[PDB]
Design an enzyme around this catalytic site. Sequence first.
Site, PDB file in Angstrom:
ATOM      1  CG  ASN B 349     -29.496 -71.541  11.583  1.00 44.15           C
ATOM      2  OD1 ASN B 349     -29.181 -71.279  12.755  1.00 44.15           O
ATOM      3  ND2 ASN B 349     -28.587 -71.784  10.630  1.00 44.15           N
ATOM      4  CB  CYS B 351     -25.435 -75.102  12.058  1.00 41.75           C
ATOM      5  SG  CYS B 351     -25.365 -76.164  10.596  1.00 41.75           S
ATOM      6  CD  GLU B 353     -25.462 -70.994  11.735  1.00 45.81           C
ATOM      7  OE1 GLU B 353     -24.903 -71.009  10.609  1.00 45.81           O
ATOM      8  OE2 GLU B 353     -26.180 -71.928  12.158  1.00 45.81           O
TER       9      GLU B 353
HETATM   10  N1  ADP Z   1     -25.671 -80.359   4.815  1.00 46.75           N
HETATM   11  C1  ADP Z   1     -26.255 -79.143   4.699  1.00 46.75           C
HETATM   12  N2  ADP Z   1     -27.381 -78.987   3.947  1.00 46.75           N
HETATM   13  C2  ADP Z   1     -27.983 -77.782   3.802  1.00 46.75           C
HETATM   14  N3  ADP Z   1     -27.518 -76.658   4.394  1.00 46.75           N
HETATM   15  C3  ADP Z   1     -26.398 -76.671   5.183  1.00 46.75           C
HETATM   16  C4  ADP Z   1     -25.680 -77.950   5.385  1.00 46.75           C
HETATM   17  N4  ADP Z   1     -24.624 -77.687   6.184  1.00 46.75           N
HETATM   18  C5  ADP Z   1     -24.664 -76.357   6.470  1.00 46.75           C
HETATM   19  N5  ADP Z   1     -25.722 -75.742   5.879  1.00 46.75           N
HETATM   20  C6  ADP Z   1     -26.102 -74.292   5.964  1.00 46.75           C
HETATM   21  O1  ADP Z   1     -24.932 -73.488   6.154  1.00 46.75           O
HETATM   22  C7  ADP Z   1     -24.825 -73.059   7.517  1.00 46.75           C
HETATM   23  C8  ADP Z   1     -23.683 -73.791   8.215  1.00 46.75           C
HETATM   24  O2  ADP Z   1     -22.466 -73.346   7.593  1.00 46.75           O
HETATM   25  P1  ADP Z   1     -21.127 -74.241   7.538  1.00 46.75           P
HETATM   26  O3  ADP Z   1     -21.349 -75.573   8.236  1.00 46.75           O
HETATM   27  O4  ADP Z   1     -20.080 -73.288   8.056  1.00 46.75           O
HETATM   28  O5  ADP Z   1     -20.965 -74.550   5.935  1.00 46.75           O
HETATM   29  P2  ADP Z   1     -19.906 -73.965   4.828  1.00 46.75           P
HETATM   30  O6  ADP Z   1     -18.546 -74.036   5.483  1.00 46.75           O
HETATM   31  O7  ADP Z   1     -20.022 -74.945   3.684  1.00 46.75           O
HETATM   32  O8  ADP Z   1     -20.378 -72.563   4.488  1.00 46.75           O
HETATM   33  C9  ADP Z   1     -26.145 -73.347   8.212  1.00 46.75           C
HETATM   34  O9  ADP Z   1     -26.687 -72.114   8.698  1.00 46.75           O
HETATM   35  C10 ADP Z   1     -27.026 -74.031   7.163  1.00 46.75           C
HETATM   36  O10 ADP Z   1     -28.189 -73.244   6.823  1.00 46.75           O
END
Ligand code: ADP
Lengths: 660, 660
Positions: B349, B351, B353
């Site tokens: 996906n 990031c 994970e």
């Molecule tokens: N800039 C972004 N745009 C769209 N989706 C994102 C973005 N950053 C993270 N995500 C989504 O959230 C997940 C990453 O979570 P995280 O970086 O821990 O964000 P948060 O702390 O805001 O929940 C990924 O699986 C992705 O699908």
Amino acid sequence: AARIAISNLHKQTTKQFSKVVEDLYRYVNAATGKPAPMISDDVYNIVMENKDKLNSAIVYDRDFQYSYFGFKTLERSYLLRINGQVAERPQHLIMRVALGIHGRDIEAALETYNLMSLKYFTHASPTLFNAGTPKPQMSSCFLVAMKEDSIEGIYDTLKECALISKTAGGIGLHIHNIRSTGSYIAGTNGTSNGLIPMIRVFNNTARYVDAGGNKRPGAFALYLEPWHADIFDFIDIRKNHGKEEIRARDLFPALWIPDLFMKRVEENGTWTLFSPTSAPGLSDCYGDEFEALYTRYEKEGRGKTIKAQKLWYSILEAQTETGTPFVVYKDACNRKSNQKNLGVIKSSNLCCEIVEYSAPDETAVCNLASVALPAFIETSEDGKTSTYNFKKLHEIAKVVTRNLNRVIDRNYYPVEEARKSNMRHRPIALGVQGLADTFMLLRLPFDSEEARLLNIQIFETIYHASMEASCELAQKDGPYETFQGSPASQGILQFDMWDQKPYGMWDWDTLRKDIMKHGVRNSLTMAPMPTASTSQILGYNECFEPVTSNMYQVVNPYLLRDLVDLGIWDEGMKQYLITQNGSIQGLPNVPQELKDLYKTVWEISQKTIINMAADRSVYIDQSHSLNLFLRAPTMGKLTSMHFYGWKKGLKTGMYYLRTQ
Amino acid sequence: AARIAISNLHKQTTKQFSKVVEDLYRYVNAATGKPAPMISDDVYNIVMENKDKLNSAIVYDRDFQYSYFGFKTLERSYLLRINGQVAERPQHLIMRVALGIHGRDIEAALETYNLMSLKYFTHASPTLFNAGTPKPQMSSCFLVAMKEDSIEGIYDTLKECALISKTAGGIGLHIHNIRSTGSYIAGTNGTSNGLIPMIRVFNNTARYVDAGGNKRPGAFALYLEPWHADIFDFIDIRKNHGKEEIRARDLFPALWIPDLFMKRVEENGTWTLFSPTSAPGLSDCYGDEFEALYTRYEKEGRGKTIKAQKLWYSILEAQTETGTPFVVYKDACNRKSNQKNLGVIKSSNLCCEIVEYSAPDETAVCNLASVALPAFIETSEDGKTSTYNFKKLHEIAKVVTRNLNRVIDRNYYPVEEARKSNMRHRPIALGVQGLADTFMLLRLPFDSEEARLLNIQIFETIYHASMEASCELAQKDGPYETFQGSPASQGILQFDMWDQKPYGMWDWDTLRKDIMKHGVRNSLTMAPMPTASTSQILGYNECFEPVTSNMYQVVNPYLLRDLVDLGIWDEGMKQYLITQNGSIQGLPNVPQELKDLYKTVWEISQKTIINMAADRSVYIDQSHSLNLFLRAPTMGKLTSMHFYGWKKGLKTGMYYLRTQ
Ligand SMILES: Nc1ncnc2c1ncn2[C@@H]1O[C@H](COP(=O)(O)OP(=O)(O)O)[C@@H](O)[C@H]1O
Ligand SMILES: Nc1nc2c(ncn2[C@H]2C[C@H](O)[C@@H](COP(=O)(O)OP(=O)(O)OP(=O)(O)O)O2)c(=O)[nH]1
Ligand SMILES: Nc1nc2c(ncn2[C@H]2C[C@H](O)[C@@H](COP(=O)(O)OP(=O)(O)OP(=O)(O)O)O2)c(=O)[nH]1
Ligand SMILES: Nc1ncnc2c1ncn2[C@@H]1O[C@H](COP(=O)(O)OP(=O)(O)O)[C@@H](O)[C@H]1O
Ligand SMILES: [Mg+2]
Ligand SMILES: [Mg+2]
């Protein structure tokens, strides 16, 4: 010098047509090993059930009817290629097209072949490319309704434009129902960025879906009513400076202009910009009903008000620098159309010639052919005196009508919205080329009174022919199923809706009688086009416009002849023609009648041009592609040319603006 | 200095929660006059049928648990706004989320509220934004299958990405089935321009569909197996020089790497590039079956051969300059997944994970929450000695499991492919934050043996908890309907597929017994994420990574405290910290144990990092987001860090590469 490149293709090509067909039909992609038949089953069988008639019908001398850069056009992109090498002789192309059209009707097939070989008429590029091939996509025009003001509708429409764009054919896309910059979005409590970023998407899909394989990137025209709130950036779409993120340089902006706008501009009054969410229904009416809705919305404080002439000034500044936006008059189109019984028409097309009804579930299609005007000139019983054979013109236009109507039934539609649309209404489009040559050959300057009378006669005979042929078809097979309720069903024809009596060469009363009784096969029939590539295949001047120059180097063949006749042609003569940029005016030792006949379009008043367009338009079902030309263009100069055309009641006021 | 901005919101906000709800529920867009309820009917009724319990449950002192730039994060984009002005206090947000999740189960609702207020755990941004609102879109991850190698499939997929992109949530898109530059197209006897121009389309749709209104442009990750023929331009997508037409600077390239590729590279051998049309089936198998297909295609001359190390060199040159492409190992993912009974998995996906099965008709979704590691530190019965409460961790992870599984049933899916996917398989994802703080607080340097043991224990307890909670759910309601046939159905759990025995804190045999008997509710449960924005809301260090600097100006609060304790903190101390760029090493008057505990990540060996990732991964159902860090990076330096990770059997070998 140009039979040298003709008689090398005759060198490196099979003679017998059926062998060429077999060759094409049995073709296999070497780099892949998959069978890639370049002919349909249907047409293959028909050639083979009739080998001997068809093979002996072709006359290969007719390959020399072609010109210097006329043949090398057919060569470089029309004749079917085998291994990057040409495999089809000009006559083979022609015979294929005739069969693709006619099927088992061999008699019709041979008739078409002959008249095309002899250069009486030609079909449009898509028909020349695809007729007779496995999936025959012969249509040039698609008018697409933006399906809904939502991401789903938007992306459904984008899909459809790609599916259409990948198989030839230009697009007219109307977008008046898309909410503008700033507008509220419920589903995500957010604010819209409007038309320009959305235009960038369609732009990007245009440069990616380079028609078919890598043939050539798409061309879209976009249609907007100038009351839309993003209008100021929409008109500027083709400027070549300022912020790069606000342009979109592969698309053409086109204005769908209501009468009300032009009034406010000459009144030096006000103009109110809306988003279609704050002002629904506006593109779903015209004329009086529209002015009643618009005026109320204007009263209800629903939009933003501007000085009408502030917009106009921008529009003209855009046109002067980039030659765009195009100008087409919404009200003229709707009020004078035989499709009115279906609902309100929302746009034209890529070259501002088609005027047909579209909706989310019906995408308008049109199939096109052009008649060659010079072909009917007859210098009869004495020479050094020529006449124009109108009886033959009427004859030919009748066959072209039958072809185009058969094309409807045998065409492959890239999308189901198109097939539904055509099977119900059956529109058709005929046009012309070689007007200037016709004028030049008949010794009539373009601005003569004699030229004006000729224009009118030609277009009258074409319209009458096509309606009659269409009436006979409604006798065999029924009328088109949407006929009940049409202006035609009651005896109102095109010139009728301009409140004019026809010029009178042909018998309109008997035609009307028959039509009211048995119906007609086609909702529409006439739409003169640009002929930008088909005209040079045949060697005539583009369209129904005067010459741009007496030297394209290669000199005007009618001029050239004349200067020799008079002796005066030498070397002082060679020079002052490349010097004076194709102009023979103000040339020391040259007679007046020549100066008069060989006016360059930059030397003819644009008022004359508009008049001739106004004259022929009463005989046109649909519309036509009117370019405009100017030397040292001032804001005032342009203003008067727009208003002049509008007041003549034109559908298409301006196509391009060419300058300097 | 940061209670000054906290106690102005308390000034300009309603106290009573139900009044805040009513306010939100009755909201109307002034500029438009349409009712814009910011709460669903469902939750409105539940608040009102229970006004008094709920209102008295909230403790408003819990609003001071927040930091300097921690609160101003909640403020600037999390708390629901009314008229561009904040209308929700931190506690209100929390209580809303608890109800959005639990419905009429008030007891569960209050449990969730408390543990969140106290900062035990938090849900991911989408849940924080949308829980309790009219159309609740709580999921962060979508893994999309490119639907078909055709314009229709392509544009169907593009639509779906826009529909997903307009309502929060990041995208992983796998494209291995799109034919490459040069490939033959039957329908138009033409030649494809490949991936890069197509990438430009998705890029353009990303910058246009700025999530929802104007919230923020989309983020896509693209997944390709490195045998695809356009690979060399695909990896270069984020370079900031050379021809602008070949880049695509808002997207992230990610490699879906088969083991075979890494062998050829260390062998210094050959590598063969294919188009998926000349080599079908390759992404529809893995491991042995794949190497059997690939090798045969390689033998059958079906592609183009290159020196494996030529590609590698480019890949490293790309990573060194731009920090991308990401690296994820296809074979590790498929071989060690409880979803294997469904078919082959094709990507991760955004990031790196999530590891879940997708297909044209099933789009994988995952919903995420993070546990706060520092919260379970207990300095118990003497002080100046701390322990870690694992029994509480197990407790909490069980509730987070119940929430996430309830979220599945109450989520609004933007597309039907998503709803079909989740209702059948029910995947779930838990993660963590504040590891570095946990280490720092417990006086363990990140590279200590003590730190290594702790990492292992934490992740074991989280996995065991979640599986048990999921087992009880399968007793009430059935197992998920795809359970029959799974590795879990036979007693194979995650560490099993790494051929390891569990560390042993919890009783795995009884859990396995129960599972085999009654099934489990969720196909999957664990996937540690980046926590890039949620971690600073809570004030802990991002993720499970060490600190980047002892000074973000604001100094490390654990370091800061220590320098005062020792006196040495003065002005020479203020300076050599902004001078030495956050490093305390080589600082004249500073004790060794401090130097050891406050190593910046540029001072810890990346070998240590990889080991700890390898250790926890046996307890992870899915995968995790592993960044890598380097001082003066050489080609050799990087090479060894990639291979090292690959050989540990990691799913995600590299997320970003940060440098200098
Ligand atoms: N800039 C972004 N745009 C769209 N989706 C994102 C973005 N950053 C993270 N995500 C989504 O959230 C997940 C990453 O979570 P995280 O970086 O821990 O964000 P948060 O702390 O805001 O929940 C990924 O699986 C992705 O699908
Ligand atoms: N640029 C951009 N425009 C959008 C976005 N979402 C919606 N729009 C524009 C496109 C459409 O013209 C218009 C309506 O979009 P939809 O109908 O998909 O939105 P929705 O139905 O949620 O809201 P509605 O109730 O119809 O206003 O809003 C977006 O995320 N980015
Ligand atoms: N850039 C570009 N690519 C195209 C175009 N037409 C097709 N492609 C590419 C996109 C797809 O990956 C692939 C197959 O497209 P389609 O399946 O729509 O083509 P078609 O079914 O006619 O040919 P096929 O028999 O499937 O090879 O070719 C085009 O006009 N422009
Ligand atoms: N560059 C182009 N790309 C796509 N379609 C075109 C283009 N030029 C013309 N057309 C289509 O053909 C019509 C114009 O015909 P014309 O310029 O006479 O071409 P031709 O002589 O090749 O038939 C328009 O209605 C439009 O739909
Ligand atoms: Mg909608
Ligand atoms: Mg296909």
